[PDB]
Amino acid sequence: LNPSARIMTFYPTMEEFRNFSRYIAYIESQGAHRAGLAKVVPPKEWKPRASYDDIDDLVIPAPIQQLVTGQSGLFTQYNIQKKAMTVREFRKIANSDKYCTPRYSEFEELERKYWKNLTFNPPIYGADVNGTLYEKHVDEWNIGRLRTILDLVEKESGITIEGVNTPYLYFGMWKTSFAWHTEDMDLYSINYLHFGEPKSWYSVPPEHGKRLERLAKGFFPGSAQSCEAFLRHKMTLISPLMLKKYGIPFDKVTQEAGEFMITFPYGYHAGFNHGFNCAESTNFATRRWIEYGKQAVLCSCRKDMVKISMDVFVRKFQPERYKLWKAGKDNTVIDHTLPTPEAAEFL
Ligand SMILES: O=C(O)c1ccc(O)c2ncccc12
Ligand code: NI
Ligand SMILES: [Zn+2]
């Protein structure tokens, strides 16, 4: 139902909003997932926190300086880790005259300045901060407890993986970036921008993901040779012009404060922050993900790589396939357009 696989936007009513799992099934039934990325504007009367005036003392244990290098729309991003700092001192830096958002009229203009000045004046990104900004009693779309089947991991093994089955906070300033990547184990993610300047996103349809990898391997032959999935290192930036020039289908969308972005299995995404802002994210799953999890190609070169045992999911949700899967003979091919089984009630 999304032939053009464009990025859809949904405005759920407070009743529709209440059950998270259920609503994800609904937007998949609308074809949202085909774009790789989808936006969800929450009911006006929804708020996850009363005031963000109390966080100035919150610690960012490991702010990152993002050094980018390259030319002609192809870049590699190197992380230089800085000393800890509080949200307050970070916001002074972000708003300071050297790190703050350039002046501009339309978005396209800011986008052009980003791709022009990307390798200059390296910003700091308050990334991967363990925490949440939700109030204990928020029962709608609480990133800390979404109740999806991804809960099986910690439930059956006690295993937690920071930012994956726990939430992460990201304090951005102008010109800070996330490189091109799909999620760990090719999961879904949910991103909520608590406050501040927009965050803009690019995405390639999962249907065309393989194209983007082909392109990437040609541009960084070295990295590709050394690691089966070097894009998972999250150091590879590629401008939209470069994508256009080589025929990769992609779409754009700007996320403003108070909106959600949902990433879908094997949806490659990237983007940048407009200025000082704050976001929370974690991963989650649906039944549709299980198969992606089984076939996710994982980083083969680094020790600190996330690898979830699919075993528990295969027994509980694909019992008839388990033996065949452990014998390495499960040849299921994935149809990236099919909606998740739970969406049948909406069809
Ligand atoms: O930092 C971000 O804005 C961001 C956005 C979307 C993602 O999928 C990310 N994944 C890993 C780290 C950061 C991000
Ligand atoms: Ni991510
Ligand atoms: Zn690797």
Cβ distance 136 to 48 under 8 Å? Answer: no
Tell whether 100 is in a known binding site: no
Distance, CA of 107 to CA of 272 (rounded, Å): 12
Examine residue 234 and state whether it is found in any structural domain, yes or no: yes
269 part of the active site: yes
70 part of the active site: no
Residues 6+ away with beta carbon under 8 Å from 38: 7, 8, 9, 10, 27, 32, 261, 262, 264
DSSP 8-state code for residue 279: E
**Ligand 2: distance of its center to the CA of 320 in Å?**
32
Q: Which of 260, 278, 281 to mutate to test the pocket of ligand 1 (most atoms within 8 A of CB)?
A: 281
Please spell the DSSP secondary structure of 85-154, one letter per residue.
EEHHHHHHHHHSTTTSPPP-SSHHHHHHHHHHHTTSS--EEEEEEE---S-TT--SS-TT----GGGHHH
Cβ distance 82 to 163 under 8 Å? Answer: no
Query: What range defines the domain where residue 175 resides?
Result: 7-347
Q: Which of 36, 126, 163, 209 is catalytic?
A: 163
Q: Which strand ranges, in their side-by-side order, compose the sheet holding 177-181?
A: 177-181, 268-273, 199-204, 251-255
Examine residue 125 and state whether it is found in any structural domain, yes or no: yes
Q: Which of 269, 274, 292, 293 is catalytic?
A: 269
258 part of the active site: no
Residues 6+ away with beta carbon under 8 Å from 269: 36, 37, 178, 180, 181, 182, 201, 202, 203, 204, 263
The reply to whether ligand 1 has any atom less than 6 angstroms from the CB of 269 is yes
Tell whether 181 is in a known binding site: yes
* Number of domains making up the chain: 1
Examine residue 236 and state whether it is found in any structural domain, yes or no: yes
Q: Which strand ranges, in their side-by-side order, compose the sheet holding 277-284?
A: 9-10, 37-40, 260-263, 188-196, 277-284, 168-172, 124-130, 64-71, 74-81, 236-238
Examine residue 308 and state whether it is found in any structural domain, yes or no: yes
Distance, CA of 188 to CA of 186 (rounded, Å): 7
| CATH code at position 15 | 2.60.120.650
User: Terminal CA-to-CA distance of the chain, rounded, Å?
Assistant: 11
Examine residue 1 and state whether it is found in any structural domain, yes or no: no
**Ligand 3: distance of its center to the CA of 302 in Å?**
5
Residue type at 320 in one-letter notation: E
Residues 6+ away with beta carbon under 8 Å from 342: 21, 22, 25, 286, 287
- Show the tokens assigned to 24: 């994800």
Distance, CA of 142 to CA of 342 (rounded, Å): 20
- Show the tokens assigned to 237: 């930036």
213 part of the active site: no
**Ligand 2: distance of its center to the CA of 329 in Å?**
30
Tell whether 199 is in a known binding site: yes
Q: Which of 28, 111, 183, 197 is catalytic?
A: 183
Strands 64-71 and 124-130: antiparallel
Examine residue 191 and state whether it is found in any structural domain, yes or no: yes
Distance, CA of 345 to CA of 276 (rounded, Å): 41
DSSP E strands: which ranges in the chain? Answer: 9-10, 37-40, 59-60, 64-71, 74-81, 85-86, 124-130, 168-172, 177-181, 188-196, 199-204, 236-238, 251-255, 260-263, 268-273, 277-284
Cβ distance 235 to 155 under 8 Å? Answer: no
Cβ distance 63 to 37 under 8 Å? Answer: no
Helices (H) and strands (E) in the chain, counts: 11, 16
**Ligand 3: distance of its center to the CA of 296 in Å?**
13
Which-ligand-closest: CA of 234? Answer: 1
Examine residue 2 and state whether it is found in any structural domain, yes or no: no
Closest CA to 60 of 28, 92, 16, 30: 92
